[PDB]
Paper text:
AtBFN2 (also called ENDO2) is a 34.5 kDa glycoprotein (the predicted mass for protein component alone is 30.5 kDa), encoded by the Arabidopsis thaliana At1g68290 gene. AtBFN2 follows the standard glycosylation pattern of plant S1/P1 endonucleases, with three glycosylation sites (Asn91, Asn110, and Asn184). While the P1 nuclease has a higher specificity for RNA over ssDNA, in a previous study we showed that the opposite is true for AtBFN2. Structurally, Zn2+-dependent endonucleases present a unique fold, and are classified into the P1/S1 nuclease family (pfam ID PF02265), itself part of the Phospholipase C (PLC)/P1 nuclease superfamily (pfam ID CL0368).
Finally, we obtained a detailed ssDNA•AtBFN2 co-crystal structure by soaking the crystals with a thiophosphorylated ssDNA analog. In this structure a large secondary ssDNA binding site was observed. A single deoxythymidine monophosphate residue was bound to the active site, in much the same way as has been described for P1 nuclease. The thymine moiety was stacked against Tyr59 and lodged within a pocket comprising the peptide backbones of His130, Lys137, and Gly138, and the side-chains of Tyr59, Asn61, and Leu129. The deoxyribose was bound to Asn140 at the ring oxygen, while the 3′-end was tightly coordinated to Zn2, displacing the Wat3, which was present in the other three structures. Under these conditions, we also found a single sulfate anion within the binding pocket, which had displaced the other waters, including catalytically relevant Wat1. The secondary binding site is completely novel, and much larger than the active site pocket. In it, elements from both the protein and the N-glycan at Asn91 participate in the binding of a dinucleotide composed of one adenosine, and one thymidine. Indeed, GlcNAc1 at Asn91 interacts via its acetyl group with the 3′-end of the thymidine deoxyribose, which also interacts with the backbone of Lys81. The secondary binding site possibly reveals a new and crucial role for glycosylation at Asn91, since GlcNAc1 is an important partner in binding the dinucleotide.
Numbering used by the authors: 1 to 99, 107 to 201, 203 to 263
The structure:
Amino acid sequence: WGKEGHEIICKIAQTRLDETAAKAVKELLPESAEGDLSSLCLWADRVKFRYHWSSPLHYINTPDACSYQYNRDCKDESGEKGRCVAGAIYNYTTQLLSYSEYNLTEALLFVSHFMGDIHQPLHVSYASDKGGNTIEVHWYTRKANLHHIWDSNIIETAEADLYNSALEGMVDALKKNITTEWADQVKRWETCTKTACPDIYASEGIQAACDWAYKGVTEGDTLEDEYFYSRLPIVYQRLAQGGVRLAATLNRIFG
Ligand SMILES: *[C@@H]1O[C@H](CO)[C@@H](O[C@@H]2O[C@H](CO)[C@@H](O[C@@H]3O[C@H](CO[C@H]4O[C@H](CO)[C@@H](O)[C@H](O)[C@@H]4O)[C@@H](O)[C@H](O[C@H]4O[C@H](CO)[C@@H](O)[C@H](O)[C@@H]4O)[C@@H]3O)[C@H](O)[C@H]2NC(C)=O)[C@H](O)[C@H]1NC(C)=O
Ligand SMILES: *[C@@H]1O[C@H](CO)[C@@H](O[C@@H]2O[C@H](CO)[C@@H](O[C@@H]3O[C@H](CO)[C@@H](O)[C@H](O[C@H]4O[C@H](CO)[C@@H](O)[C@H](O)[C@@H]4O)[C@@H]3O)[C@H](O)[C@H]2NC(C)=O)[C@H](O)[C@H]1NC(C)=O
Ligand SMILES: *[C@@H]1O[C@H](CO)[C@@H](O[C@@H]2O[C@H](CO)[C@@H](O[C@H]3O[C@H](CO)[C@@H](O)[C@H](O)[C@@H]3O)[C@H](O)[C@H]2NC(C)=O)[C@H](O)[C@H]1NC(C)=O
Ligand SMILES: Nc1ncnc2c1ncn2[C@H]1C[C@H](O)[C@@H](COP(=O)(O)O)O1
Ligand SMILES: Cc1cn([C@H]2C[C@H](O)[C@@H](COP(=O)(O)O)O2)c(=O)[nH]c1=O
Ligand SMILES: [Zn+2]
Ligand SMILES: [Zn+2]
Ligand SMILES: [Zn+2]
């Protein structure tokens, strides 16, 4: 996701932390964050080049189908097993269980960002179009690629048009639905019979890529109201799942 997506996810997560996780997060965040996890939930994107090894950890590539399997798909272009967003979640969650040889501030920042990214449907999608990056279309009147539409445009368009430029408006509406509309689902979202369950989230993601993101889109299309309104609920779902799961995972880790 772009900035707004990670902010929403980390804001949702922050308020669902239990006291032990809230305390550990306070301790692990730098002072410049002023205690706000969401202030640093894009940090991982800002070290993709400084930490060149980290770039493939933001996503998963699959074959041209609607399935994901860790052993088959979790590797980078070099073929190194584990080097995908699911593997990264396993890695950084395991490190945080120690709360060495590792910088656990980075571990927290990585796991927070990656838990978000693994919920972006096109972050678990086809190698053949680089997760929709090579599908060039228009978002209303402006040129955009499909991946960017999912990272940013849908959310930014909702933020402006539907929420009158209040990002807290979308956070608040998601939080209300988590409590009053999706309560049974949320309990399932939180449940993990391991510390982290990223393969569940990736499998949902590739299915969404097939059924919602790629669905109906061709090179050169103009995506506007029809696509926007029909896909917004899935974006809401994934952001909500991301926040709920990030909190549940941190709670398990620090508890
Ligand atoms: C789990 O989380 C950890 C912590 O963030 C990640 O650890 C990093 O892993 C990468 C490799 O995947 C490391 O980067 C590589 O470092 C090599 C040498 O690093 C030495 O120093 C580190 C400590 O900083 C020690 O582990 C040890 O002393 C190492 O010997 C470099 O040689 C590599 O660069 C060269 O090869 C690459 C391609 O392979 C080229 O692109 C480069 O240009 C260069 O030629 C590379 O930089 C990194 O150092 C690790 N950091 C730490 C703190 O340990 C894991 O990757 C992560 N795994 C997941 C998520 O799956
Ligand atoms: C655990 O990991 C975290 C995250 O990587 C790390 O915190 C980071 O520390 C660095 C370096 O200490 C901070 O970057 C500095 O920011 C200050 C702002 O006050 C600048 O003054 C610094 O600039 C100088 O140093 C640079 C060094 O390369 C020079 O290039 C530059 O020209 C200046 O001389 C520097 O940018 C960074 O802000 C934090 N990041 C976060 C998110 O807090 C922490 O130190 C690690 N813990 C360890 C190693 O124990
Ligand atoms: C929070 O949950 C709210 C209740 O589910 C939801 O409001 C509802 O949003 C749906 C769209 O998902 C609207 O349903 C629309 O569905 C048909 C099918 O295309 C449309 O043709 C209709 O016009 C219909 O509006 C509901 O009307 C709407 N319900 C209410 C009471 O306003 C919110 O969108 C959810 N918000 C978040 C952030 O998740
Ligand atoms: N198919 C499959 N499922 C899950 N994990 C896998 C799989 N293949 C390899 N691994 C790795 C991923 C983690 O690094 C490690 C512990 O996962 P843990 O699940 O925490 O024991 O096992
Ligand atoms: C290459 C690639 C990038 N991405 C993501 C990472 C970034 O969010 C965005 C752009 O990355 P890029 O600038 O390296 O192409 O797309 C995927 O989801 N799948 C891919 O196969
Ligand atoms: Zn992202
Ligand atoms: Zn992206
Ligand atoms: Zn990212």
